[PDB]
Write a protein that binds this ligand. Sequence first.
Ligand SMILES: Nc1ccc2c(NC3CC3)nc(-c3ccccc3)nc2c1
Ligand SMILES: O=c1c2ccccc2ncn1-c1ccccc1
Length: 337
Amino acid sequence: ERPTFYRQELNKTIWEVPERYQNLSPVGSYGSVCAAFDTKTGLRVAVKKLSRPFQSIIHAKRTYRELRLLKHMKHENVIGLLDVFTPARSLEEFNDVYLVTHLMGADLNNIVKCQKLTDDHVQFLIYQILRGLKYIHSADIIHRDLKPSNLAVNEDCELKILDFGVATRWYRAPEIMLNWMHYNQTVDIWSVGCIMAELLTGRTLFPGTDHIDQLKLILRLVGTPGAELLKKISSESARNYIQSLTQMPKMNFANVFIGANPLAVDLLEKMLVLDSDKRITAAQALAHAYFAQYHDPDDEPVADPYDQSFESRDLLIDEWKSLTYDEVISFVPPPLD
Ligand SMILES: Nc1ccc2c(NC3CC3)nc(-c3ccccc3)nc2c1
Ligand SMILES: O=c1c2ccccc2ncn1-c1ccccc1
Protein backbone atom coordinates (compact mmCIF):
# COMPACT_ATOMS: atom_id res chain seq x y z
CA GLU A 1 0.00 0.00 0.00
CA ARG A 2 2.99 2.35 0.67
CA PRO A 3 3.25 5.22 -1.83
CA THR A 4 6.40 6.33 -3.66
CA PHE A 5 8.33 9.14 -2.10
CA TYR A 6 10.69 11.62 -3.68
CA ARG A 7 13.57 13.54 -2.11
CA GLN A 8 14.55 17.19 -2.41
CA GLU A 9 16.35 19.81 -0.40
CA LEU A 10 14.27 22.80 0.53
CA ASN A 11 16.49 25.52 1.92
CA LYS A 12 18.42 24.30 4.95
CA THR A 13 16.52 20.95 5.08
CA ILE A 14 15.93 17.60 3.26
CA TRP A 15 12.27 16.86 2.37
CA GLU A 16 10.99 13.39 1.57
CA VAL A 17 7.32 13.40 0.60
CA PRO A 18 4.92 11.21 -1.41
CA GLU A 19 4.60 11.83 -5.18
CA ARG A 20 1.04 12.88 -4.41
CA TYR A 21 2.42 16.28 -3.31
CA GLN A 22 4.14 18.47 -5.86
CA ASN A 23 5.72 21.87 -6.42
CA LEU A 24 6.96 22.33 -2.86
CA SER A 25 7.59 25.92 -1.94
CA PRO A 26 8.80 27.24 1.47
CA VAL A 27 6.37 29.50 3.38
CA GLY A 28 7.86 30.04 6.86
CA SER A 29 9.52 28.44 9.92
CA TYR A 30 8.69 23.40 15.97
CA GLY A 31 9.60 22.69 12.27
CA SER A 32 9.36 24.30 8.80
CA VAL A 33 6.45 24.48 6.33
CA CYS A 34 6.03 24.16 2.55
CA ALA A 35 3.15 25.08 0.28
CA ALA A 36 2.42 22.17 -2.06
CA PHE A 37 -0.06 21.03 -4.66
CA ASP A 38 -2.00 17.94 -3.78
CA THR A 39 -2.71 15.73 -6.80
CA LYS A 40 -5.35 13.59 -5.01
CA THR A 41 -7.75 16.48 -4.34
CA GLY A 42 -6.38 19.33 -6.45
CA LEU A 43 -6.14 21.64 -3.42
CA ARG A 44 -3.27 23.70 -2.15
CA VAL A 45 -1.93 22.32 1.13
CA ALA A 46 0.66 23.10 3.79
CA VAL A 47 3.18 20.37 4.59
CA LYS A 48 4.97 20.79 7.88
CA LYS A 49 8.10 18.75 8.53
CA LEU A 50 8.65 18.62 12.31
CA SER A 51 12.10 19.55 13.51
CA ARG A 52 13.91 16.74 15.42
CA PRO A 53 10.55 15.36 16.61
CA PHE A 54 12.16 12.74 18.89
CA GLN A 55 15.43 14.24 20.12
CA SER A 56 14.19 14.52 23.77
CA ILE A 57 11.35 13.50 26.10
CA ILE A 58 9.89 16.93 25.66
CA HIS A 59 10.04 16.85 21.85
CA ALA A 60 8.75 13.31 21.73
CA LYS A 61 5.71 14.08 23.93
CA ARG A 62 5.12 17.41 22.03
CA THR A 63 5.13 15.59 18.69
CA TYR A 64 2.63 13.07 20.12
CA ARG A 65 0.49 15.90 21.56
CA GLU A 66 0.26 17.89 18.35
CA LEU A 67 -0.52 14.80 16.29
CA ARG A 68 -3.23 13.73 18.76
CA LEU A 69 -4.72 17.23 18.76
CA LEU A 70 -4.75 17.60 14.93
CA LYS A 71 -6.22 14.15 14.42
CA HIS A 72 -9.04 15.09 16.76
CA MET A 73 -10.19 18.39 15.24
CA LYS A 74 -13.13 18.07 12.89
CA HIS A 75 -14.77 21.44 12.61
CA GLU A 76 -15.00 24.22 9.95
CA ASN A 77 -13.37 26.83 12.12
CA VAL A 78 -10.46 24.70 13.43
CA ILE A 79 -7.47 23.48 11.41
CA GLY A 80 -7.63 19.73 10.77
CA LEU A 81 -5.33 16.96 9.56
CA LEU A 82 -5.52 16.24 5.80
CA ASP A 83 -2.64 13.75 5.99
CA VAL A 84 0.27 12.66 8.13
CA PHE A 85 3.10 10.52 6.85
CA THR A 86 6.69 9.41 7.34
CA PRO A 87 9.27 8.19 4.82
CA ALA A 88 10.12 5.37 7.32
CA ARG A 89 9.12 1.80 6.50
CA SER A 90 9.26 0.48 10.10
CA LEU A 91 9.09 1.66 13.74
CA GLU A 92 12.87 1.17 14.00
CA GLU A 93 13.40 3.39 10.94
CA PHE A 94 10.85 6.02 12.18
CA ASN A 95 12.44 9.48 12.53
CA ASP A 96 10.63 12.13 10.48
CA VAL A 97 7.05 13.33 10.86
CA TYR A 98 5.26 15.43 8.26
CA LEU A 99 1.80 16.95 8.78
CA VAL A 100 -0.58 18.03 6.01
CA THR A 101 -3.31 20.71 6.32
CA HIS A 102 -5.25 23.10 4.05
CA LEU A 103 -3.27 26.16 3.04
CA MET A 104 -5.09 29.30 4.11
CA GLY A 105 -4.32 32.63 2.44
CA ALA A 106 -3.23 34.82 5.33
CA ASP A 107 -3.47 35.30 9.08
CA LEU A 108 -5.41 37.97 10.95
CA ASN A 109 -2.15 39.66 11.79
CA ASN A 110 -2.12 40.59 8.07
CA ILE A 111 -5.71 41.68 7.45
CA VAL A 112 -5.60 43.90 10.60
CA LYS A 113 -2.01 45.26 10.39
CA CYS A 114 -2.52 46.59 6.85
CA GLN A 115 -6.05 48.02 7.52
CA LYS A 116 -9.12 48.63 9.74
CA LEU A 117 -12.07 46.26 9.33
CA THR A 118 -15.70 47.31 9.20
CA ASP A 119 -18.18 46.23 11.91
CA ASP A 120 -19.81 43.46 9.85
CA HIS A 121 -16.36 41.96 9.15
CA VAL A 122 -15.54 42.02 12.87
CA GLN A 123 -18.88 40.28 13.60
CA PHE A 124 -18.19 37.53 11.13
CA LEU A 125 -14.55 36.93 12.11
CA ILE A 126 -15.19 36.99 15.91
CA TYR A 127 -18.29 34.74 15.38
CA GLN A 128 -16.17 32.12 13.63
CA ILE A 129 -13.46 32.23 16.39
CA LEU A 130 -16.16 31.71 19.03
CA ARG A 131 -17.69 28.92 17.03
CA GLY A 132 -14.35 27.06 16.78
CA LEU A 133 -13.65 27.82 20.46
CA LYS A 134 -17.01 26.38 21.53
CA TYR A 135 -15.99 23.16 19.81
CA ILE A 136 -12.38 23.14 21.14
CA HIS A 137 -13.66 23.87 24.69
CA SER A 138 -16.36 21.24 24.56
CA ALA A 139 -13.49 18.75 24.32
CA ASP A 140 -11.80 20.05 27.47
CA ILE A 141 -8.97 21.56 25.43
CA ILE A 142 -7.70 25.08 26.10
CA HIS A 143 -5.89 26.80 23.26
CA ARG A 144 -3.79 29.07 25.61
CA ASP A 145 -2.13 31.09 22.92
CA LEU A 146 -4.85 32.65 20.75
CA LYS A 147 -3.54 35.65 18.79
CA PRO A 148 -3.88 37.15 15.31
CA SER A 149 -1.07 35.03 13.82
CA ASN A 150 -2.80 31.77 14.97
CA LEU A 151 -5.95 32.74 13.08
CA ALA A 152 -5.99 31.83 9.37
CA VAL A 153 -8.33 33.63 7.00
CA ASN A 154 -8.89 32.94 3.34
CA GLU A 155 -10.05 35.52 0.74
CA ASP A 156 -13.62 34.47 1.47
CA CYS A 157 -13.24 35.60 5.18
CA GLU A 158 -13.64 32.04 6.35
CA LEU A 159 -11.47 31.61 9.47
CA LYS A 160 -9.73 28.61 11.05
CA ILE A 161 -8.00 28.52 14.42
CA LEU A 162 -4.49 26.99 14.42
CA ASP A 163 -1.91 25.80 17.01
CA PHE A 164 -4.33 25.00 19.96
CA GLY A 165 -3.21 23.11 23.11
CA VAL A 166 3.93 40.29 17.65
CA ALA A 167 4.30 39.25 21.38
CA THR A 168 2.21 36.29 22.72
CA ARG A 169 2.04 38.23 26.03
CA TRP A 170 -0.24 40.93 24.50
CA TYR A 171 -3.18 38.52 24.27
CA ARG A 172 -2.75 36.68 27.60
CA ALA A 173 -5.20 36.69 30.42
CA PRO A 174 -4.04 38.45 33.55
CA GLU A 175 -4.35 35.24 35.64
CA ILE A 176 -1.66 33.76 33.33
CA MET A 177 0.52 36.88 33.68
CA LEU A 178 0.27 36.18 37.43
CA ASN A 179 1.08 32.48 37.03
CA TRP A 180 -2.10 30.92 38.49
CA MET A 181 -1.98 27.15 38.16
CA HIS A 182 -5.78 26.52 37.94
CA TYR A 183 -6.87 28.97 35.19
CA ASN A 184 -9.48 27.45 32.90
CA GLN A 185 -11.04 27.72 29.41
CA THR A 186 -11.89 31.42 29.68
CA VAL A 187 -8.25 32.41 29.25
CA ASP A 188 -9.16 31.92 25.55
CA ILE A 189 -12.14 34.27 25.87
CA TRP A 190 -9.82 36.94 27.19
CA SER A 191 -7.59 36.55 24.14
CA VAL A 192 -10.66 36.83 21.76
CA GLY A 193 -11.58 40.02 23.56
CA CYS A 194 -8.09 41.44 22.92
CA ILE A 195 -8.26 40.40 19.24
CA MET A 196 -11.78 41.76 18.76
CA ALA A 197 -10.67 45.03 20.41
CA GLU A 198 -7.68 45.23 18.04
CA LEU A 199 -9.87 44.59 14.96
CA LEU A 200 -12.26 47.41 15.92
CA THR A 201 -9.58 50.04 16.67
CA GLY A 202 -6.54 48.99 14.61
CA ARG A 203 -4.30 48.96 17.70
CA THR A 204 -2.97 46.38 20.13
CA LEU A 205 -5.22 46.74 23.17
CA PHE A 206 -2.53 45.83 25.75
CA PRO A 207 0.96 46.22 24.17
CA GLY A 208 2.97 45.51 27.36
CA THR A 209 6.77 45.44 27.22
CA ASP A 210 6.92 42.69 29.81
CA HIS A 211 4.79 40.82 32.33
CA ILE A 212 4.59 43.74 34.84
CA ASP A 213 3.84 46.41 32.24
CA GLN A 214 1.35 43.95 30.65
CA LEU A 215 -0.55 43.69 33.93
CA LYS A 216 -0.42 47.48 34.48
CA LEU A 217 -2.00 48.14 31.10
CA ILE A 218 -4.68 45.54 31.75
CA LEU A 219 -5.67 46.78 35.23
CA ARG A 220 -5.81 50.32 33.91
CA LEU A 221 -8.74 49.34 31.66
CA VAL A 222 -10.47 46.70 33.77
CA GLY A 223 -9.61 48.22 37.20
CA THR A 224 -7.80 46.71 40.16
CA PRO A 225 -9.30 43.53 41.66
CA GLY A 226 -12.24 44.01 44.03
CA ALA A 227 -12.57 42.27 47.40
CA GLU A 228 -14.64 39.44 45.89
CA LEU A 229 -11.86 38.55 43.46
CA LEU A 230 -9.07 39.12 46.02
CA LYS A 231 -10.52 36.56 48.46
CA LYS A 232 -10.32 33.84 45.75
CA ILE A 233 -6.55 34.32 45.30
CA SER A 234 -4.58 31.51 47.01
CA SER A 235 -1.06 32.92 46.58
CA GLU A 236 0.11 35.32 49.25
CA SER A 237 2.76 37.07 47.16
CA ALA A 238 0.35 37.47 44.22
CA ARG A 239 -2.37 38.87 46.51
CA ASN A 240 0.19 41.25 48.01
CA TYR A 241 1.42 42.32 44.60
CA ILE A 242 -1.99 43.38 43.19
CA GLN A 243 -3.03 44.76 46.59
CA SER A 244 0.13 46.88 46.81
CA LEU A 245 -0.79 48.43 43.49
CA THR A 246 -2.37 51.80 42.69
CA GLN A 247 -6.13 51.23 42.98
CA MET A 248 -7.31 51.83 39.39
CA PRO A 249 -11.12 52.06 38.82
CA LYS A 250 -12.86 49.99 36.13
CA MET A 251 -13.12 52.06 32.97
CA ASN A 252 -16.41 52.53 31.13
CA PHE A 253 -15.70 50.63 27.89
CA ALA A 254 -18.19 52.78 25.89
CA ASN A 255 -15.71 55.64 26.49
CA VAL A 256 -12.63 53.74 25.48
CA PHE A 257 -14.28 52.18 22.38
CA ILE A 258 -15.98 55.43 21.35
CA GLY A 259 -18.41 55.04 18.45
CA ALA A 260 -18.16 51.27 18.10
CA ASN A 261 -21.37 49.33 17.75
CA PRO A 262 -22.69 49.35 21.35
CA LEU A 263 -23.47 45.63 21.10
CA ALA A 264 -19.70 45.17 20.46
CA VAL A 265 -18.76 47.35 23.43
CA ASP A 266 -21.11 45.24 25.52
CA LEU A 267 -19.66 41.88 24.32
CA LEU A 268 -16.17 43.29 25.05
CA GLU A 269 -17.27 44.14 28.60
CA LYS A 270 -18.36 40.55 28.99
CA MET A 271 -15.10 39.01 27.62
CA LEU A 272 -12.64 41.31 29.31
CA VAL A 273 -13.84 40.76 32.89
CA LEU A 274 -10.88 40.65 35.25
CA ASP A 275 -12.29 37.77 37.37
CA SER A 276 -12.18 34.69 35.20
CA ASP A 277 -15.16 33.14 37.06
CA LYS A 278 -17.42 35.93 35.71
CA ARG A 279 -16.12 36.00 32.10
CA ILE A 280 -18.53 34.96 29.35
CA THR A 281 -17.97 31.46 27.88
CA ALA A 282 -17.71 30.74 24.12
CA ALA A 283 -21.19 29.08 24.02
CA GLN A 284 -22.76 32.07 25.84
CA ALA A 285 -20.98 34.62 23.64
CA LEU A 286 -22.40 32.99 20.47
CA ALA A 287 -25.96 33.70 21.67
CA HIS A 288 -25.07 37.37 22.29
CA ALA A 289 -27.02 40.04 20.46
CA TYR A 290 -23.91 41.18 18.52
CA PHE A 291 -23.96 37.95 16.48
CA ALA A 292 -27.67 38.24 15.59
CA GLN A 293 -27.12 37.66 11.86
CA TYR A 294 -24.85 34.57 12.15
CA HIS A 295 -25.75 32.62 15.25
CA ASP A 296 -27.53 29.34 14.64
CA PRO A 297 -27.98 27.05 17.71
CA ASP A 298 -28.37 24.07 15.35
CA ASP A 299 -25.06 24.59 13.57
CA GLU A 300 -22.61 25.25 16.39
CA PRO A 301 -21.55 21.65 17.04
CA VAL A 302 -19.53 20.30 19.97
CA ALA A 303 -16.64 17.84 19.76
CA ASP A 304 -16.27 14.15 20.63
CA PRO A 305 -14.51 13.50 23.96
CA TYR A 306 -10.75 13.79 23.70
CA ASP A 307 -8.54 11.56 25.87
CA GLN A 308 -5.82 13.70 27.34
CA SER A 309 -4.87 11.28 30.12
CA PHE A 310 -1.52 10.96 28.34
CA GLU A 311 -0.69 14.49 29.48
CA SER A 312 -0.07 13.33 33.04
CA ARG A 313 2.24 10.43 32.00
CA ASP A 314 6.00 10.27 32.29
CA LEU A 315 7.33 8.01 29.54
CA LEU A 316 10.61 7.28 27.76
CA ILE A 317 11.50 8.88 24.41
CA ASP A 318 11.06 5.54 22.68
CA GLU A 319 7.65 5.00 24.22
CA TRP A 320 6.30 8.40 23.03
CA LYS A 321 7.88 7.63 19.68
CA SER A 322 6.05 4.33 19.40
CA LEU A 323 2.75 5.95 20.47
CA THR A 324 3.20 8.59 17.71
CA TYR A 325 4.05 5.82 15.25
CA ASP A 326 0.79 4.08 16.18
CA GLU A 327 -1.14 7.31 15.47
CA VAL A 328 0.51 7.73 12.04
CA ILE A 329 -0.51 4.15 11.17
CA SER A 330 -4.14 4.42 12.28
CA PHE A 331 -4.76 7.73 10.49
CA VAL A 332 -7.90 7.65 8.34
CA PRO A 333 -7.90 10.44 5.70
CA PRO A 334 -10.99 12.72 6.01
CA PRO A 335 -13.99 12.04 3.63
CA LEU A 336 -13.43 13.53 0.14
CA ASP A 337 -16.09 16.12 -0.96
N1 LIG B 1 -11.15 31.81 41.25
C1 LIG B 1 -10.17 32.60 40.85
C2 LIG B 1 -10.44 33.68 39.99
C3 LIG B 1 -9.39 34.51 39.57
C4 LIG B 1 -8.08 34.28 40.02
C5 LIG B 1 -7.01 35.09 39.64
N2 LIG B 1 -7.18 36.15 38.82
C6 LIG B 1 -6.07 37.09 38.61
C7 LIG B 1 -6.49 38.57 38.69
C8 LIG B 1 -6.15 37.96 37.35
N3 LIG B 1 -5.78 34.79 40.07
C9 LIG B 1 -5.55 33.74 40.89
C10 LIG B 1 -4.24 33.47 41.31
C11 LIG B 1 -3.96 32.41 42.18
C12 LIG B 1 -2.63 32.13 42.54
C13 LIG B 1 -1.60 32.92 42.02
C14 LIG B 1 -1.89 33.97 41.15
C15 LIG B 1 -3.20 34.25 40.79
N4 LIG B 1 -6.56 32.96 41.27
C16 LIG B 1 -7.82 33.20 40.87
C17 LIG B 1 -8.88 32.37 41.29
O1 LIG C 1 2.17 25.81 9.87
C1 LIG C 1 1.27 26.08 9.07
C2 LIG C 1 1.33 27.24 8.28
C3 LIG C 1 2.41 28.13 8.37
C4 LIG C 1 2.45 29.28 7.58
C5 LIG C 1 1.40 29.54 6.70
C6 LIG C 1 0.32 28.66 6.60
C7 LIG C 1 0.28 27.50 7.38
N1 LIG C 1 -0.77 26.66 7.29
C8 LIG C 1 -0.86 25.54 8.02
N2 LIG C 1 0.16 25.21 8.94
C9 LIG C 1 0.11 24.03 9.71
C10 LIG C 1 0.56 22.83 9.14
C11 LIG C 1 0.55 21.65 9.87
C12 LIG C 1 0.09 21.66 11.19
C13 LIG C 1 -0.35 22.85 11.77
C14 LIG C 1 -0.34 24.04 11.04
